[PDB]
Design an enzyme around this catalytic site. Structure first.
Site, PDB file in Angstrom:
ATOM      1  N   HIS A  62      50.738 100.680  38.982  1.00 33.46           N
ATOM      2  CA  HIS A  62      51.318  99.647  38.080  1.00 33.46           C
ATOM      3  C   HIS A  62      52.627 100.151  37.467  1.00 33.46           C
ATOM      4  CE1 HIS A  62      47.299  97.950  38.627  1.00 33.46           C
ATOM      5  NE2 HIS A  62      46.797  99.057  38.082  1.00 33.46           N
ATOM      6  N   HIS A  94      58.431  99.719  31.937  1.00 32.94           N
ATOM      7  CA  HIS A  94      58.377  98.443  32.686  1.00 32.94           C
ATOM      8  C   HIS A  94      59.801  98.110  33.068  1.00 32.94           C
ATOM      9  CE1 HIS A  94      54.273  97.727  31.101  1.00 32.94           C
ATOM     10  NE2 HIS A  94      54.779  98.496  30.128  1.00 32.94           N
ATOM     11  N   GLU A 104      59.535  93.742  28.551  1.00 34.19           N
ATOM     12  CA  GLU A 104      58.371  92.899  28.203  1.00 34.19           C
ATOM     13  C   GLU A 104      58.684  92.137  26.905  1.00 34.19           C
ATOM     14  OE1 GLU A 104      54.896  95.587  28.611  1.00 34.19           O
ATOM     15  OE2 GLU A 104      54.728  94.382  30.427  1.00 34.19           O
ATOM     16  N   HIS A 117      57.624 102.556  26.716  1.00 35.00           N
ATOM     17  CA  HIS A 117      56.458 102.511  25.821  1.00 35.00           C
ATOM     18  C   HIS A 117      55.914 103.921  25.614  1.00 35.00           C
ATOM     19  CE1 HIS A 117      55.706  98.077  26.929  1.00 35.00           C
ATOM     20  NE2 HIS A 117      56.709  98.247  26.030  1.00 35.00           N
TER      21      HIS A 117
HETATM   22  N1  LIG Z   1      51.958  98.509  28.259  1.00 37.80           N
HETATM   23  S1  LIG Z   1      51.166  99.161  26.950  1.00 37.80           S
HETATM   24  O1  LIG Z   1      50.834  98.090  26.062  1.00 37.80           O
HETATM   25  O2  LIG Z   1      51.947 100.200  26.267  1.00 37.80           O
HETATM   26  C1  LIG Z   1      49.717 100.032  27.486  1.00 37.80           C
HETATM   27  C2  LIG Z   1      49.448 101.256  26.952  1.00 37.80           C
HETATM   28  C3  LIG Z   1      48.363 102.000  27.338  1.00 37.80           C
HETATM   29  C4  LIG Z   1      47.533 101.492  28.296  1.00 37.80           C
HETATM   30  N2  LIG Z   1      46.391 102.249  28.748  1.00 37.80           N
HETATM   31  C5  LIG Z   1      46.282 103.638  28.787  1.00 37.80           C
HETATM   32  O3  LIG Z   1      47.070 104.456  28.323  1.00 37.80           O
HETATM   33  C6  LIG Z   1      45.006 104.111  29.519  1.00 37.80           C
HETATM   34  N3  LIG Z   1      45.188 105.452  30.048  1.00 37.80           N
HETATM   35  C7  LIG Z   1      46.099 105.712  31.062  1.00 37.80           C
HETATM   36  O4  LIG Z   1      46.687 104.915  31.793  1.00 37.80           O
HETATM   37  N4  LIG Z   1      46.145 107.082  31.140  1.00 37.80           N
HETATM   38  C8  LIG Z   1      45.322 107.785  30.183  1.00 37.80           C
HETATM   39  C9  LIG Z   1      46.285 108.572  29.346  1.00 37.80           C
HETATM   40  C10 LIG Z   1      46.717 109.920  29.890  1.00 37.80           C
HETATM   41  C11 LIG Z   1      45.833 111.064  29.462  1.00 37.80           C
HETATM   42  C12 LIG Z   1      44.551 111.038  30.239  1.00 37.80           C
HETATM   43  C13 LIG Z   1      43.700 109.804  30.072  1.00 37.80           C
HETATM   44  C14 LIG Z   1      44.186 108.578  30.802  1.00 37.80           C
HETATM   45  C15 LIG Z   1      44.783 106.623  29.435  1.00 37.80           C
HETATM   46  O5  LIG Z   1      44.040 106.727  28.469  1.00 37.80           O
HETATM   47  C16 LIG Z   1      47.775 100.240  28.837  1.00 37.80           C
HETATM   48  C17 LIG Z   1      48.894  99.498  28.442  1.00 37.80           C
HETATM   49 ZN   LIG Z   2      53.703  99.393  28.637  1.00 36.08          ZN
END
Ligand SMILES: NS(=O)(=O)c1ccc(NC(=O)CN2C(=O)NC3(CCCCCC3)C2=O)cc1
Ligand SMILES: [Zn+2]
Length: 258
Positions: A62, A94, A104, A117
């Site tokens: 993504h 993004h 966004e 972000h």
């Molecule tokens: N577009 S947004 O609104 O900023 C937005 C922000 C965060 C997420 N979701 C996450 O961060 C979920 N997630 C990952 O993808 N990687 C991890 C972080 C890295 C350390 C190891 C754990 C895995 C984790 O916890 C989705 C959208």
């Molecule tokens: Zn984001």
């Protein structure tokens, strides 16, 4: 899940597997600069990245995430609208297929070429998984990217992208200093919202900086060579990985500045 950004799996489909897609505090939103109100109740914003410990860069199909060691209070965001301490866990971007789209959030309906972000979780909830279950679980610092002069502190990110072209590829990414991605000014807008990707959890305090950073056309062209697909699969260029603006509903956007 098989969500993405195509005609068949894009933002207009997300609500079928993630009904909160149509919820009361979804992100991103348009920032109407004229109706955002200066809030004197906002405390000074504190970005403390001196001890940030980057570890790895991952193409997750993504976007690409620069991941940090969040096992201690090393890189934190505090103040502004925030109560307590939020720990940096990852950043990503993004971006668009062309320079006229990719952010966004929008500013008076203006779309920037990209948006950064910087994702932080509230330490009172102990881990990221618990924090996303809370309405004040996360603080995302959003920074707009316009195409102009190169951003020197972005180039180490640009130069590693060749090694993570496809979904599931990662590379070592130690000793990266995220302070090189900030603009001069920390003037911001803030509002309560959500993750902008499934699961679209309504757990984010959004803090969007008014001053964009300049990146070069060559820098953003390298983002656009990434792939949404895995190795050996049909090539889908990783472009236009942005959710459009969602209804503001019963929310106010507050400005840190007059
Ligand atoms: N577009 S947004 O609104 O900023 C937005 C922000 C965060 C997420 N979701 C996450 O961060 C979920 N997630 C990952 O993808 N990687 C991890 C972080 C890295 C350390 C190891 C754990 C895995 C984790 O916890 C989705 C959208
Ligand atoms: Zn984001």
């Amino acid at each position: 899940h098989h969500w993405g950004y195509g005609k068949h799996n894009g933002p207009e489909h997300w609500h079928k597997d993630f009904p909160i897609a149509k919820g009361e505090r979804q992100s991103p939103v348009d920032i109407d600069t004229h109706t955002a109100k200066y809030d004197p109740s906002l405390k000074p914003l504190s970005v403390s990245y001196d001890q940030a410990t980057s570890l790895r860069i991952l193409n997750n199909g993504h976007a690409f995430n620069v991941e940090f060691d969040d096992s201690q209070d090393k890189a934190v965001l505090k103040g502004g609208p925030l109560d307590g301490t939020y720990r940096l866990i990852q950043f990503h971007f993004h971006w668009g297929s062309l320079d006229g789209q990719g952010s966004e959030h929008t500013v008076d309906k203006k779309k920037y070429a990209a948006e950064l972000h910087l994702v932080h979780w509230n330490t009172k909830y102990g881990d990221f998984g618990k924090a996303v279950q809370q309405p004040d679980g996360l603080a995302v610092l959003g920074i707009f990217l316009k195409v102009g002069s190169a951003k020197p502190g972005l180039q180490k990110v640009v130069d590693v992208l060749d090694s993570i072209k496809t979904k599931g590829k990662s590379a070592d990414f130690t000793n990266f200093d995220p302070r090189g991605l900030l603009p001069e000014s920390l003037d911001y807008w803030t509002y309560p919202g959500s993750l902008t990707t499934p699961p679209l959890l309504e757990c984010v305090t959004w803090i969007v900086l008014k001053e964009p950073i300049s990146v070069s056309s060559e820098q953003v062209l390298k983002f656009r060579k990434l792939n949404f697909n895995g190795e050996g699969e049909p090539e889908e260029l990783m472009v236009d990985n942005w959710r459009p603006a969602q209804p503001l509903k019963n929310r106010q956007i507050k400005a840190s500045f007059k």
